[PDB]
């Protein structure tokens, strides 16, 4: 569902149809460059979204003070230090999931109990 | 609480409530009066049960009875021994006389 | 099932509401008749497999002896159930001419759906005969059986005049009621009539009031 | 009496407080109608023949709640399927031979995907929604669908034709999503059912708090909800008394209004006497229609120019 | 009769496609024709519900999941009952069935809504019922010079009153 | 009295324990997800219910301890002034402060007030004034108390003008 731009001039290729061989010609509209696409999927909606709970993992989260600290272990490095915080995707509908990130292994892991 | 029998058994009055209670045990006339009064009462019960559909009994109403009969007792010294000299005919006529002498709408016509 | 059963049951209940319309309007209908069961109704009015035939399902009716005894002037009424979802100008023209020919003064007409104004511009024709219109959707449920609706009854002109002379009003100080009111349309009354209203008060139980249909 | 009633209603409105509207603004709305909702709820009582059948109550809910494709569509995607009688998507072959046991169509597949829970919560098997859109058009759209027994629910549809098809399909599916009713009467939203009770007369002639289930909503409509099956048409009730007045006549209108005003002023600081409230209701309803006390409502009566 | 022979052709195709290729070809086409007559015992090309039930049974045979239904219909599952089943939600297969009841149970749970429950005490008595099941609230309504309102809510009968 | 004070303290402590248990269950993502309500709504309802029960229980405990020679008891059962909640708040516990039903919201991002780490829901962080008017308030609790009082004042200052108009 991503956009492929015309390499010859940076504009996204548009879906247009072979009138006889029946192929997906992503053609440029700016210039005349044409491209054959890979899959018959073109448009895509996703009427229900449920993603974004682990947002903004920067490489140096531990430099902030205001994040709390705990004593669970990273199940890659088993260091007893770690940082946890609430899910990032602030909807009225989200959960109490805690995402633990450890400074040692720089690795994220949750505590789901399904 | 309300049903009285003057010729049957089960709901018969104790005759020591009224000195003329023994001899009237058997009169058809007073029995008829009591029975029609009882029918009037049960019609009232059905009517109230269809107007206050829940069954709430406490309601705002005019002049209180309970204080009046209470101080009637405390004025005229009711006892536990003397049978009353009230007669059944007297009671059931007096209630209807008061029933009509209550007056909110003056007038003379059918609508009023 | 699909929509056939809903159509059958809706028509059945509309017929019930109809019938009790006419009954409390003062025309003489056997008490058993209004609770006629649905399967019996369909047995009376199925043609081939499930289709109801509304054209023959209409009926005439007669004022009661009592309603005549008080009200000296009501002729027979007559009801109608056209089968077209629209309303045909010639169809209602035949209807109103049939009312005129049979010498009827109150003509009950029921439409499936919308009425073109050409087929309803001449509704107020032929006085003193009056024509009344109804949707089945407006008749699928009897309005008066709702418990917030109090009892409504009609006033003769004589006792209305008596009422005015007693309470010393003059004919405009009464509280009003719209012509387009649902209960007003249920009773079918017109301008200048008085409806006595009996509702279940809470400080005296039973309480009287009157309205004017102006 | 009128001034007495007015003061007796006015002063305990001063010491009164400020989901559902209440308090000062609700009193202002119901005293100043203003046919605006902010809580257009209406309580629905079931048929007494269905006392406690939760499945029956849910069935009435599914009959009454308005639903469109938003309620049921999970995923929508578009496709270029060149073959009018075979599928580029591997899975959608059994569906093809089901519907093959009338050719001049664009080779531009539109695909839908639903939730089984969002179908059978409301007892919509997808068979009738497939034939529902089929009878919605019957002229322009092939509509092909799955079985209800599959693990994935898809609707196959193509436009028949006697270039540019991308945005026409976009507009068509937009209309699809928006406007096709499925079941239930419009202006009714998510409906919930509580477990109430009622001091019903006991068969031995007493009173008992016998429970029963009630349907409750968040929208308003009256001309249809009375007409649905399995319902008590008599005891239906709405907060928005203007619609009550319109459907039931102004007697029931003023009764509902009195109920509403008593509810508001008895949420706290009860009670005023009945007769004052009744007088306010009656002077507000004694014109054949509702008459708000505004700068214009009662003011534009045939009344003295000086007052 | 075209619909008759088409349903027969489909039935012969799906039973020949079974893993148990039945050497009793005449017996299985007898099963096919007897399913045809008991199927048309509903409407016999008079209503589209005949086609709908045809779709239901045809795709249930096809589905895989489940495949074992082919052997079960080949070795039993007396089809005059299977005209009158309508009972696709209770077949093909059991795990999907179990999924269906748990879906329905969760839906019924999510239907019924808010049930706030009014925490009580036992100190006051009811203004009407006169029993001690009393529940309250606090907030202050009027101006600052006075305390809270001390709202009351009986639960033996549902009464409301207030204390200053 | 000392022992009653000690019982008050342990009552509030076990209420805090119940709250912490609920928070653990919520953070472990298994909850009943109360019907008609969203997950966080259920969590908030449970915790507010627990805290108010704690306040009521403590206030009842103080009142039933209190001697018959206590004068505020003499007035309060003598009619005129005072209240059960007044006795409870002056001696046992203030209780959870309020800003329209919800407790004190994260005005600062992820926290109520800049003296705590982010993403807490323990009642002292979000505003349960555990303490009592005799002992005085820790300054955070003092601030939340100021919030609740301010809400009451502004509500009065608007309702008076609107009710005057609509009386006229
Ligand atoms: Mg004037
Ligand atoms: Zn280009
Ligand atoms: Zn690690
Ligand atoms: Zn009570």
Swiss-Prot record, chain A:
Belongs to the archaeal RpoM/eukaryotic RPA12/RPB9/RPC11 RNA polymerase family. Present with 2440 molecules/cell in log phase SD medium. This is DNA-directed RNA polymerase II subunit RPB9. It is found in: Nucleus, Nucleolus. SMART domains: RPOL9, ZnF_C2C2. The modification Phosphoserine is found at residue 39. Pfam families: Zn_ribbon_RPB9, Zn_ribbon_TFIIS. InterPro entries: DNA-dir_RNA_pol-M_15_CS (IPR019761), Rpa12/Rpb9/Rpc10/TFS (IPR012164), Zn_ribbon_RPB9 (IPR001529), Zn_ribbon_RPB9_C (IPR034012), Znf_TFIIS (IPR001222). One of its GO terms (cellular component) is nucleus. The lineage of its organism: Eukaryota, Fungi, Dikarya, Ascomycota, Saccharomycotina. Component of the RNA polymerase II (Pol II) complex consisting of 12 subunits. Zn(2+) 1 binds at residues 6, 9, 28, 31. One of its GO terms (molecular function) is nucleic acid binding. GO terms for biological process: maintenance of transcriptional fidelity during transcription elongation by RNA polymerase II; RNA-templated transcription; transcription by RNA polymerase II; transcription elongation by RNA polymerase II; transcription initiation at RNA polymerase II promoter; transcription-coupled nucleotide-excision repair. It comes from Saccharomyces cerevisiae (strain ATCC 204508 / S288c). A zinc finger (TFIIS-type) spans 70-110. Keywords: DNA damage, DNA repair, DNA-directed RNA polymerase, Metal-binding, Nucleus, Phosphoprotein, Transcription, Zinc, Zinc-finger. A zinc finger (C4-type) spans 6-31.
Curated annotation (Swiss-Prot), chain B:
The tandem 7 residues repeats in the C-terminal domain (CTD) can be highly phosphorylated. The phosphorylation activates Pol II. Phosphorylation occurs mainly at residues 'Ser-2' and 'Ser-5' of the heptapeptide repeat. The phosphorylated form of Pol II appears to carry, on average, one phosphate per repeat. The phosphorylation state is believed to result from the balanced action of site-specific CTD kinases and phosphatases, and a 'CTD code' that specifies the position of Pol II within the transcription cycle has been proposed. Disulfide bonds: none annotated. It is found in: Nucleus. Component of the RNA polymerase II (Pol II) complex consisting of 12 subunits. Interacts with DEF1; the interaction is direct and serves to bridge RPB1 to the Elongin complex in a DNA-damaged dependent manner. Interacts with the Elongin subunit ELA1. Interacts with the Elongin subunit ELC1. Interacts with ASK10. Interacts with ESS1. Interacts with RTT103. Interacts with SHE2. Belongs to the RNA polymerase beta' chain family. The C-terminal domain (CTD) serves as a platform for assembly of factors that regulate transcription initiation, elongation, termination and mRNA processing. This is DNA-directed RNA polymerase II subunit RPB1. It comes from Saccharomyces cerevisiae (strain ATCC 204508 / S288c) (Baker's yeast).
Swiss-Prot record, chain C:
One of its GO terms (molecular function) is DNA binding. It comes from the Eukaryota. Keywords: DNA-binding, DNA-directed RNA polymerase, Nucleus, Ribosome biogenesis, Transcription. SUPFAM superfamilies: Eukaryotic RPB5 N-terminal domain, RPB5-like RNA polymerase subunit. GO terms for biological process: nucleolar large rRNA transcription by RNA polymerase I; ribosome biogenesis; RNA-templated transcription; termination of RNA polymerase I transcription; termination of RNA polymerase III transcription; transcription by RNA polymerase I; transcription by RNA polymerase II; transcription by RNA polymerase III. One of its GO terms (cellular component) is nucleoplasm. It is found in: Nucleus. Pfam families: RNA_pol_Rpb5_C, RNA_pol_Rpb5_N. Gene3D superfamilies: RNA polymerase, Rpb5, N-terminal domain, RPB5-like RNA polymerase subunit. Component of the RNA polymerase I (Pol I), RNA polymerase II (Pol II) and RNA polymerase III (Pol III) complexes. Component of the RNA polymerase I (Pol I) complex consisting of 14 subunits: RPA135, RPA190, RPC40, RPA14, RPB5, RPO26, RPA43, RPB8, RPA12, RPB10, RPC19, RPC10, RPA49 and RPA34. The complex is composed of a horseshoe-shaped core containing ten subunits (RPA135, RPA190, RPB5, RPO26, RPB8, RPB10, RPC10, RPA12, RPC19 and RPC40) where RPA135 and RPA190 form the DNA-binding cleft. PANTHER family: DNA-DIRECTED RNA POLYMERASES I, II, AND III SUBUNIT RPABC1. Belongs to the archaeal Rpo5/eukaryotic RPB5 RNA polymerase subunit family.
Curated annotation (Swiss-Prot), chain E:
Zn(2+) binds at residues 126, 129, 154, 157. A zinc finger (TFIIS-type) spans 122-162. It comes from the Eukaryota. One of its GO terms (biological process) is transcription initiation at RNA polymerase II promoter. GO terms for molecular function: RNA polymerase II complex binding; RNA polymerase II complex recruiting activity; RNA polymerase II transcription regulatory region sequence-specific DNA binding; zinc ion binding. Its main location: nucleus. Keywords: DNA-binding, Metal-binding, Nucleus, Phosphoprotein, Transcription, Transcription regulation, Zinc, Zinc-finger. Residues 3-119 form the TFIIS central domain. It is found in: Nucleus. Necessary for efficient RNA polymerase II transcription elongation past template-encoded arresting sites. The arresting sites in DNA have the property of trapping a certain fraction of elongating RNA polymerases that pass through, resulting in locked ternary complexes. Cleavage of the nascent transcript by S-II allows the resumption of elongation from the new 3'-terminus. Can promote the transfer of one strand of a double-stranded DNA molecule to a homologous single strand and thus may be involved in recombination. Belongs to the TFS-II family. S-II binds to RNA-polymerase II in the absence of transcription. Present with 6260 molecules/cell in log phase SD medium. This is Transcription elongation factor S-II. The gene is DST1.
